[PDB]
Design a protein around this ligand. Structure first.
Ligand SMILES: O=C(c1ccc(-n2nnc3cccnc32)cc1)N(c1ncccc1Cl)[C@@H]1CCCNC1
Ligand SMILES: [Mg+2]
Ligand SMILES: [Mg+2]
Ligand SMILES: [Mg+2]
Ligand SMILES: [Mg+2]
Ligand SMILES: [Mg+2]
Ligand SMILES: [Mg+2]
Ligand SMILES: [Mg+2]
Ligand SMILES: [Mg+2]
Ligand SMILES: [Mg+2]
Ligand SMILES: [Mg+2]
Ligand SMILES: [Mg+2]
Ligand SMILES: [Mg+2]
Ligand SMILES: [Mg+2]
Ligand SMILES: [Mg+2]
Ligand SMILES: [Mg+2]
Ligand SMILES: [Mg+2]
Ligand SMILES: [Mg+2]
Ligand SMILES: [Mg+2]
Ligand SMILES: [Zn+2]
Lengths: 50, 106, 61, 52, 153, 84, 26
RNA sequence: GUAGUAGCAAAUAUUCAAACGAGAACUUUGAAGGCCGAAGUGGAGAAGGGUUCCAUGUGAACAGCAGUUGAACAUGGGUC
């Protein structure tokens, strides 16, 4: 919305934190069956919508 | 082996007949590739950008009726085509098309 | 072999539109060597990218 | 069982659609929405006379 | 791996295989029967011509709505078509099968194609948009390819 | 035009992030919250939606202080330190 | 290496019924 | 099964050559032929979208053909 308030920029800050893939060393641990990030979000398809 | 060079006039007014207006002038160049392929035997035909400007200089639906072209046959190298030979069509100007005929010119 | 960066970047430097700003496809790698406005401002002032002056719309008719 | 054989909430569509008259859960998006709700013969339905 | 019809002179026959390759199944089946039994010199030479549209591939079992063509008179049939991408990938496996014939040390120009199987793969799913806001699926049909090549003794 | 070509007119947000439960439910045009009732004193829960109690009663947060009250009760709220 | 994309939940929606209502027999 | 079937038909349009590349009807440049024609297919914002902006890299997905491309994926930047 291109000029905004600070509560939204804290909310939007955390959603870009979430939005990065899986490193290749957690995948090779012991006690693991995670293959990818299922909470991955792409902005064309799935909005967060606050 | 053969490196000949001939000079042709091609009656475009009959080789385009009934091709629609927005499709007219590309078939002029499809036909010259069909013309240059057959006249020399070789398949590979590269026409000059000078030849392109001469066809297209009156729009896509008003092509000049006959074009004195020049057919040259050359050859390709340097990790080459599977062909040995190809064609380089170039545009030689002449005003009027009477008494001219297909004269093999070095 | 991808000059879309140098396409846009001259237009901000010449302060004119994108549709015009061109000559020399022959020195392709000579342009693609460059990646900055400093770099491309040398390349304007020695003759790889020219202004291509304005299409004519005479009022003589 | 005692409860929560059907925690869910559903009503049935009825006539004008070709499905059936089992209750169908209400909503969309989550792909259980539209499926068969409580009863015997459904996935995640309660059992027949839930044992007491 | 395992093949249908593991061969009967197995040291004197080289083999090749393909799995999960994005083409159409029904097109790749009919071109396999055109291949089957042809010498590998002619197997090279036939599949150049399908991509050049000079020589057809008859559609024998999956025939629904294929138009007639001129070149099915080589096959005793009416309906032919000229699949590029079936021929592109099926010419690929023959060079891979040539490559295995090189390593084992055969006489690679006595090789006929004994057995060639093409069978459907786990199909990948996409979606497109019909009227009234109803999704209908829109899915691939890749196929697995096997082949056995046996010398004509 | 009852449907699609009047959904393009959806532009202003009514519900907004509130500060007590924080669930995009704060009706700006009234200044109240539909989930936990912000300007009121008391946390909105009712007995007709059992799952809503299940979504926001205790046990689902951390209980980051109320846990160690249960830990201290195992010894009866000691106030000394240790032996050496 | 990347997880397979799409395959999102549907969400079928209501559509017109009984074709073109038109005129009932009477 | 229907099935390699319907179908990929709204708004005038492509062409020739050249480079990189396993690989070019679409990517890039260059020339021609064009249309939006100043109530614009242009230049900038409010709302809303939230990294989409920029750069580089790959070509299994995805882009309803293809791709050597991208508002894709991966990495790194930028909002005084
Ligand atoms: O599009 C439709 C339309 C036509 C037929 C169906 N039906 N009926 N039973 C059906 C079963 C399967 C598929 N379709 C079906 C649905 C809609 N229209 C329409 N026509 C006449 C009456 C009502 C309507 Cl809504 C609009 C109206 C205005 C002009 N433009 C077209
Ligand atoms: Mg949202
Ligand atoms: Mg209940
Ligand atoms: Mg159950
Ligand atoms: Mg047909
Ligand atoms: Mg559609
Ligand atoms: Mg819709
Ligand atoms: Mg209206
Ligand atoms: Mg207060
Ligand atoms: Mg068809
Ligand atoms: Mg038809
Ligand atoms: Mg080239
Ligand atoms: Mg190349
Ligand atoms: Mg007009
Ligand atoms: Mg505008
Ligand atoms: Mg960009
Ligand atoms: Mg690359
Ligand atoms: Mg595609
Ligand atoms: Mg991304
Ligand atoms: Zn609240």
């Amino acid at each position: 919305s291109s000029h905004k308030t600070f509560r939204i920029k804290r909310f939007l800050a955390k959603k870009q934190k979430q939005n990065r893939p899986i490193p290749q060393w957690i995948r090779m641990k012991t006690g693991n069956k995670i293959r990818y990030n299922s909470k991955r979000r792409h902005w064309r398809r799935t909005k967060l919508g606050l | 082996n053969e490196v000949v060079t001939r000079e042709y006039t091609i009656n475009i007014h009959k080789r385009i007949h009934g091709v629609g207006f927005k499709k007219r002038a590309p078939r002029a160049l499809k036909e010259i590739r069909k013309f240059a392929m057959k006249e020399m035997g070789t398949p590979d035909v590269r026409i000059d950008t000078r030849l392109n400007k001469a066809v297209w200089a009156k729009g896509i639906r008003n092509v000049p009726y006959r074009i004195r072209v020049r057919l040259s046959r050359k050859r390709n190298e340097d990790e080459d085509s599977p062909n040995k030979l190809y064609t380089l069509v170039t545009y030689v100007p002449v005003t009027t098309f009477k008494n001219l005929q297909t004269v093999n010119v070095d | 072999s991808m000059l879309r960066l140098q396409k846009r970047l001259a237009s901000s430097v010449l302060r004119c539109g994108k549709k015009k700003v061109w000559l020399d496809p022959n020195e392709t790698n000579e342009i693609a060597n460059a990646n900055s406005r400093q770099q491309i401002r040398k390349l304007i002032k020695d003759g790889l990218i020219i202004r291509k002056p304005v299409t004519v719309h005479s009022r003589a008719r | 069982s005692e409860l929560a054989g059907h925690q869910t909430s559903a009503e049935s569509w009825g006539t004008g659609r070709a499905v059936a008259r089992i209750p169908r859960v209400r909503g969309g998006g989550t792909h259980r929405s539209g499926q068969g709700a409580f009863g015997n013969m459904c996935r995640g339905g309660r059992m027949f006379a839930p044992t007491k | 791996v395992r093949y249908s019809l593991d061969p009967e002179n197995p040291t004197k026959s080289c083999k090749s295989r393909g799995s999960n390759l994005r083409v159409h199944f029904k097109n790749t089946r009919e071109t396999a029967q055109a291949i089957k039994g042809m010498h590998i010199r002619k197997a090279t030479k036939y599949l150049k011509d399908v991509t050049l549209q000079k020589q057809c591939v008859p559609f024998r079992r999956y025939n629904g709505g294929v138009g007639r063509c001129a070149q099915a008179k080589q096959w005793g049939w009416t309906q032919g078509r000229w699949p590029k991408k079936s021929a592109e990938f099926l010419l690929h496996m023959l060079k891979n099968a040539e490559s295995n014939a090189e390593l084992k040390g055969l006489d690679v120009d006595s090789l006929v194609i004994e057995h060639i199987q093409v069978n459907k793969a786990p199909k990948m799913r996409r979606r497109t948009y019909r009227a009234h806001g109803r999704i209908n699926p829109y899915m691939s049909s890749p196929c697995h390819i096997e082949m056995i090549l046996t010398e004509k003794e | 035009t009852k449907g699609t070509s009047s959904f393009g007119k959806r532009r202003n947000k009514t519900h907004t992030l509130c500060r007590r439960c924080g669930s995009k439910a704060y009706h700006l045009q009234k200044s109240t919250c539909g989930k936990c009732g912000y300007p009121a004193k008391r946390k909105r829960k009712y007995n007709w939606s059992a799952k809503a109690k299940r979504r926001n009663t205790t046990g689902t947060g951390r209980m980051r202080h109320l846990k160690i009250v249960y830990r201290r009760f195992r010894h009866g709220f000691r106030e000394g330190t240790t032996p050496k | 290496s990347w997880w397979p994309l799409p395959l999102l939940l549907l969400l079928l929606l209501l559509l017109g019924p009984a074709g073109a209502r038109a005129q009932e027999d009477e």
